[PDB]
Design a protein around this ligand. Structure first.
Ligand SMILES: NC(=O)C1=CN([C@@H]2O[C@H](COP(=O)(O)OP(=O)(O)OC[C@H]3O[C@@H](n4cnc5c(N)ncnc54)[C@H](OP(=O)(O)O)[C@@H]3O)[C@@H](O)[C@H]2O)C=CC1
Ligand SMILES: O=C(c1ccc(-c2nc3ccccc3o2)cc1)N1CCN(C(=O)C2(O)CC2)CC1
Length: 608
């Protein structure tokens, strides 16, 4: 009995402020801590309140309680929040392989070993080597159980010194210096940079002077607590580029920085051409194995480009290391579209960061990130409305049909270019009809506007159209070297065209539509070698659903991992470290997912 990992997939600005606003417990604790300091000058059992309360009666006291202080909910707020995961997933996404070597500085008071390995462990392919270091062996003695549980190696490193050889060519260095003292920050950071490979990341958690929490801790302990400007000056000083910034409402901060790489001349390739002629171009560019020139796919003219899913798949193929993209994707027609031509300022910023994923949406640069879903109550359907499944005679289609009938659907149109071709398809339609369900098998093809209009018309004869579900798929798997514009056309027709055509027809003629649902893939969400065209097609549908939801229309894309029992995959097999999700699991997840306000959801099952 298997437990899927359920996530939302959300546009995430590189820069976020006001983080942890909604968290009333931190809002309350801060107000209390502000009073207790206001009292010294003139959540209450938590460490920083308890320490401030002990200071009101009266150096010795805090020295005892310093090892307990990092786990104060304000001090640890950003760490136990989606901001940490966003920063980590950004590093992983920018690795040349699925091996990340991580080194924690001053782990003793840092405690990032108790979060980072666990945040990354649910990833099926990622090979993590995490080393918790500190200046004294005594520093990490209390945590020895947690280090073993999380498979964390141990090291001795005072960041005042050069790093031990062992810890060199690190991919990511992490340091929670909320409580731990770097000493001379410029020296510390300088040594931390040298320990990184070129293009390696630094993730620093700290408190900002000029913000309530830093000023409170600053006042209490009287090098130390720096302003944002000082930190950002220090990053430039040691030649780091700030590529991500997460600020809590009380001035706790995650800085995501990157050591620059000597950049060869970039190749720009527009991937907006609806004929996919750019496929042949890209093939010739990546065919040159000699070339280490980075390849920048530009989607600037089409908000529904699937470039992101494309990139995820091509990064898994030979020469994939080289690939980056720019996507302009405003949900609002009122939003400014920035100029990103070679000379421009907006592009130079993107190039300096050199991130794989550069998505511009309604004023901010960011990327789509995955976040653990919250809830993890059975749905029911209006019995008078018609329900359309494109690809309805498929593996997942026949199960989705049954599942809709169990929830009160009496009016189904199942679309298929070739109609009933198996005895199972024949048996199921015949049984449902016997059961008094109106089941139309239609060859009307959503790939064209005509077919889509025909299909809605057919549905509308049964009852007003309540739901459309795009489960249509054509596969043309192969590495890019064996792809053609025609193969891309074939894979995109049922999904991109199909979803565009349904979008437009349901807008024009389905005012009673409750459900617009497309079945995307982990192949798009995470990437799969040999499926770049499928990556793109699924990614486009997701961009359509986001747009629809922004205008208040129904829109949900579901990124399924492998499906068991029925479907393409089936026609016990661990797949890229995942189990095919059993159909009973898929269907109870879909109940959860259908009554959810998020635009793109993900479900996959991890192999143990
Ligand atoms: N199975 C899996 O492991 C996974 C599936 N998914 C997604 O889930 C969905 C269901 O896949 P699954 O049931 O496995 O696949 P199947 O191949 O079993 O069924 C898909 C059906 O789509 C039909 N189809 C293709 N193009 C069109 C079109 N233009 N109009 C109407 N019908 C069309 C095909 O029939 P015909 O040839 O007669 O047109 C086929 O029967 C797909 O969107 C897929 O991408 C995602 C992740 C994993
Ligand atoms: O080979 C995989 C595969 C690839 C990668 C992963 C995976 N990578 C991850 C990274 C991080 C987190 C979770 C992750 O999961 C899981 C499975 N398939 C089969 C095909 N497939 C399809 O859709 C079809 O082509 C049949 C239609 C999708 C699944």
């Amino acid at each position: 009995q298997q437990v899927p990992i359920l996530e939302k997939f959300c546009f995430t600005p590189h820069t976020e402020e006001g983080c942890l606003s909604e968290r009333a417990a931190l809002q309350e604790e801060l107000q209390l801590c502000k009073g207790l300091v206001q009292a010294l000058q003139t959540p209450s059992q938590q460490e920083l309140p308890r320490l401030l309360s002990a200071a009101c009666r009266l150096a010795q006291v805090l020295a005892q309680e310093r090892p307990k202080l990092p786990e104060d909910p304000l001090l640890s707020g950003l760490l136990d929040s989606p901001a940490l995961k966003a920063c980590l997933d950004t590093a992983v996404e920018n690795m040349p392989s699925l091996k990340m070597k991580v080194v924690e500085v001053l782990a003793g008071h840092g405690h990032l070993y108790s979060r980072i390995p666990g945040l990354l462990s649910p990833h099926p392919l990622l090979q993590l080597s995490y080393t918790a270091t500190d200046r004294h062996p005594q520093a990490l003695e209390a945590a020895q159980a947690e280090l073993q549980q999380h498979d964390v190696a141990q090291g001795q490193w005072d960041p005042a010194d050069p790093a031990p050889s062992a810890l060199g060519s690190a991919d990511l260095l992490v340091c929670n210096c909320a409580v731990a003292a770097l000493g001379d920050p410029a020296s510390a950071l300088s040594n931390m940079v040298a320990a990184l490979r070129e293009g390696g990341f630094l993730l620093l958690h700290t408190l900002l002077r000029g913000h309530p929490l830093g000023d409170i801790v600053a006042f209490l302990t009287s090098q130390g607590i720096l302003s944002q400007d000082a930190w950002e000056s220090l990053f430039s000083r040691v030649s780091l580029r700030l590529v991500g910034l997460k600020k809590s409402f009380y001035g706790s901060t995650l800085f995501l920085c990157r050591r620059p790489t000597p950049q060869d001349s970039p190749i720009f390739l527009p991937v907006d051409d609806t004929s996919f002629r750019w496929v042949e171009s890209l093939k010739g560019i990546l065919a040159d194995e000699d070339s280490a020139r980075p390849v920048w796919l530009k989607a600037i003219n089409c908000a529904t480009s699937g470039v992101v899913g494309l990139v995820n798949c091509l990064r898994r193929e030979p020469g994939g290391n080289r690939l980056r993209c720019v996507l302009l994707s405003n949900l609002s027609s009122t939003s400014h579209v920035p100029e990103v031509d070679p000379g421009s300022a907006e592009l130079q910023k993107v190039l300096q960061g050199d991130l794989v994923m550069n998505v511009y949406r309604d004023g901010a640069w960011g990327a789509f990130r995955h976040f653990l879903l919250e809830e993890d109550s059975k749905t029911f359907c209006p019995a008078h409305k018609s329900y359309i499944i494109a690809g309805g005679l498929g593996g997942f289609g026949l199960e989705l049909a049954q599942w809709l009938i169990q929830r009160g659907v009496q009016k189904l149109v199942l679309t298929s270019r070739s109609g009933i071709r198996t005895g199972y398809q024949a048996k199921q339609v015949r049984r449902w009809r016997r059961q008094g369900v109106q089941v139309q098998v239609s060859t009307s093809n959503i790939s064209s506007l005509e077919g889509a209009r025909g299909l809605i018309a057919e549905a509308a004869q049964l009852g007003p159209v309540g739901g459309v579900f795009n489960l249509a798929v054509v596969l043309r798997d192969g590495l890019l070297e064996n792809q053609t514009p025609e193969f891309f056309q074939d894979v995109c027709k049922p999904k991109y065209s199909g979803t565009l055509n349904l979008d437009r027809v349901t807008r024009e003629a389905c005012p009673e539509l409750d459900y617009f649902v497309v079945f995307s893939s982990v192949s798009c969400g995470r990437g799969n070698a040999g499926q770049s065209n499928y990556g793109f097609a699924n990614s486009a549908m997701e961009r359509i659903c986001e747009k629809r939801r922004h205008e208040g229309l129904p829109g949900l894309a579901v990124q399924w991992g492998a499906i068991g029992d029925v479907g393409i995959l089936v026609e016990d097999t661990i797949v890229s470290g995942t189990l095919p999700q059993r159909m009973a699991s898929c269907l109870e997840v879909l109940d959860l997912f259908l009554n959810q306000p998020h635009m793109v959801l993900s479900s996959f099952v991890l192999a143990e």
